[PDB]
Amino acid sequence: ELRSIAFSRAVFAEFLATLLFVFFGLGSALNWPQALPSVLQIAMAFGLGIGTLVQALGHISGAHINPAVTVACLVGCHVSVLRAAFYVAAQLLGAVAGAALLHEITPADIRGDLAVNALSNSTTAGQAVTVELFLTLQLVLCIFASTDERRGENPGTPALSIGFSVALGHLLGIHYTGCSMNPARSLAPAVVTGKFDDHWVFWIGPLVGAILGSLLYNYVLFPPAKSLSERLAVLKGLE
Amino acid sequence: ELRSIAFSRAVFAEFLATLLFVFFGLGSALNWPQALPSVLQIAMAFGLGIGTLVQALGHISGAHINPAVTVACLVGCHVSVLRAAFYVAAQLLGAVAGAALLHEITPADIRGDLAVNALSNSTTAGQAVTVELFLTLQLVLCIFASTDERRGENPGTPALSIGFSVALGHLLGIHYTGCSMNPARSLAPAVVTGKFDDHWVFWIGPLVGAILGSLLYNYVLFPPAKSLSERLAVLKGLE
Amino acid sequence: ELRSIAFSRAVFAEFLATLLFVFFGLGSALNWPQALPSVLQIAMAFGLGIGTLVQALGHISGAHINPAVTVACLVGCHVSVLRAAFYVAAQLLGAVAGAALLHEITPADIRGDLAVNALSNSTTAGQAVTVELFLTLQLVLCIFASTDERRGENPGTPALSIGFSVALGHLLGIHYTGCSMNPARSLAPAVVTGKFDDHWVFWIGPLVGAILGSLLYNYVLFPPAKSLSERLAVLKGLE
Amino acid sequence: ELRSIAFSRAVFAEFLATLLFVFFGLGSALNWPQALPSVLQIAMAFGLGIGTLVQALGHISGAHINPAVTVACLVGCHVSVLRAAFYVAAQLLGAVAGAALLHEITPADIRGDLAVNALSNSTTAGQAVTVELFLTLQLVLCIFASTDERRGENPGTPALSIGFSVALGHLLGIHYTGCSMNPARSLAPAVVTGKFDDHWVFWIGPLVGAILGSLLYNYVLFPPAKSLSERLAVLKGLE
């Protein structure tokens, strides 16, 4: 699987997707003095950023653009362990490269904290991790339903629904933590700016919520017909 | 039908859908001091919240996420009486659990009334119930058309159109009552906060509008070919 | 054709569509003192109002919801003269009934002019009619493309694209005339409020733009294969 | 190919698409004193303007509405050199005609600079061209994926995804350069108003980003099965 050319294109697609998502998402969330972005305006930038990249790079790599979604796909036996390892590595490397490019093009008077995720509105860490658990739970449920092969009778809008699911969470999670929903999106400006205050919330939150969202869909809500041998073959790099 | 495993998954899906809809909808409608949500911003949160859950949980339970829509489907002979009973029970229980989770994670200085539906802009109860009758009439008409099996030639966007229909009503109903459109969404913060002022509007309004919307579609606009025996078989738990 | 039951359902659908479009569109465009609607907020209400009704009532009557679109379909030989006569009559009657219902439910301190179309931003009548010509030209081009039977290979999003085309024009036409784009939507609050200042712009503008948009699509851009006898048969009530 | 009637309809469609895109996009981006458009409001006008015209004129000319996308399609061997020459000529002529019509209908007190692209927020030319390189890279990647014939199993939403990709870039690029993303959209008000300050950014930026976006999709991400003779036949006007 690693030696495949299509796999290398998938890792680069995940690298490029997280690079563009962090570039277009964090840049629109900056504190622009002339026109301060609204919560809906930031929500649509993060929202349509995923929806654009799912349309653009969904047929190449699946367009996870998120370690949490990659972990959720790993728990749901949708991707291999080696593919999930390379996708997370590509997502984390692409995010930092996306935030470093944004930090290099934005004026110094405007970057500030580069839109790091921080506990806002006097929200404690206990409440913050609970929001991120539910913010990514609806994203993973919407992603698994949109990318479900059992629903081929109604293709629907896989790109927009997944994209609008990110916008839905940002209309809520901005008021608490800036709506992380993505460990790569949180680590991208934290590495550049050195602001790692309460950074465990944006990692434990989205990952646990994605695991619970994946276990709900694949084992409780809509269980597939895959056997134990079939699930182990997908995980351990067998075609 | 009750003994079926797929039915139990449908009741849990309706429980989880109303839990997430109240969580993501009421939370974005709170009076955040730093960034007060606009009418469009609240509309898209309630709007894309339904659209996300219809994509996520439409193939499992139908994604009613509303007693009014469940009643409308019951009048239109789309669901059984026992399924409608369990869906409303799951919707009301999920909504209160969704509002209690939101009340426990939001700062005390920010919860306030937890975005209860109230008569705003000096609107009387008589005018308020008339808006909710039309707010849910367009939702039920859009839901029945999006989920119509006779329109298989053009699947369209069942998730987005239903979701955007909720956003359409919220661009109007926020100025009158906060745009209930859902007895579960109205009862969710009313139970927690104890604010039950003019609560009959948010129950009589959406239910009558959903009944009229269901009778318009199934008996006036687009009548199906189901006989009297077929309609009674669907209602009284017969497969 | 008149004696057909499906035709009577189409006239009532056009009556109900324009009733709901005027109800949900004009109400969200009112001058609410606590939360004055933005240009985008009014655009999405008029925008998603058409998109909801096209999804809801497109398979019943075509969901013109506009005399201009009905005239455009009449020029393009898509509907009969008798169907276009009854659709415009249903649209004009539904619009006034929709605006009268909105005027009866809105507080007196809030109705004001009930969001009548008026020349705003010191725009003269000459410039105003030129905008409405282009506002409805893009709507008719998007409607004819979305409802084209030759494009069955790609159904796309007929409901959302038509709906978002109305939102596109409202992001421009609000600053000039309140973005009429619909003689029924303009006549609805003008009749109730008695404000008929420069009302010819909102009739000559959208009608000429729809005729030019229909002649562009059906005779210049994408001409069909219909003969002269086929076009006359569709117009003069022949099946 | 030039003698074909369908080709002449494609050039007029590209002329009309860029005329309407500049008309509806620049007009909504003007400095209206009563209601100054937000960054999201301008983003949706430019965003839904492309999405409407892709739905309306995608089946006639491909709905490039952009020299950069036309160049990207030329590099990707999707259109001929003669078709790309005529599309750019139609796009540039339509844009100036679209901006001249908007300048003639807008009040003198409101036109101002007619929403020319300018370096805003103290952004230098070096940083500005880097944003436009990435703004058009995501547009070209989304356009090529939406119009890919290999993805016929999932048609998706070609009109909305391409349209929302333009809205995604405008949520970011407005704060830097007004989000050109289109040499025709930049040259349209620059010619009328005579404001050509740093105009090379809005030409070098989108063109290089479209070339890189086209080379990424067609040679790195999702290479097709076209041979060297097949690519040369498409480019040099051979059917």
Swiss-Prot record, chains A, B, C, D:
Catalytic activity: H2O(in) = H2O(out); glycerol(in) = glycerol(out)
A GO biological process held by the record: actin filament organization
Span of the annotated motif NPA 1: 66-68
Expression sites (tissue/organ): Expressed in collecting tubules in kidney medulla (at protein level). Detected in kidney.
Extracellular compartment spans: 31-38, 106-125, 175-178, 192-199
Function, as annotated: Forms a water-specific channel that provides the plasma membranes of renal collecting duct with high permeability to water, thereby permitting water to move in the direction of an osmotic gradient. Plays an essential role in renal water homeostasis. Could also be permeable to glycerol.
The record's note on its domains: Aquaporins contain two tandem repeats each containing three membrane-spanning domains and a pore-forming loop with the signature motif Asn-Pro-Ala (NPA).
Name of the molecule in the record: Aquaporin-2
Gene: AQP2
